[PDB]
Write a structure and sequence with these properties.
monomer, Alpha-conotoxin MII, toxin
Amino acid sequence: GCCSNPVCHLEHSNLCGAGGAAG
């Protein structure tokens, strides 16, 4: 989803982490 995107992943760093919502 959004987490798979570097920009979103950076912002949602604590939200997605390194496993949660792998897309």
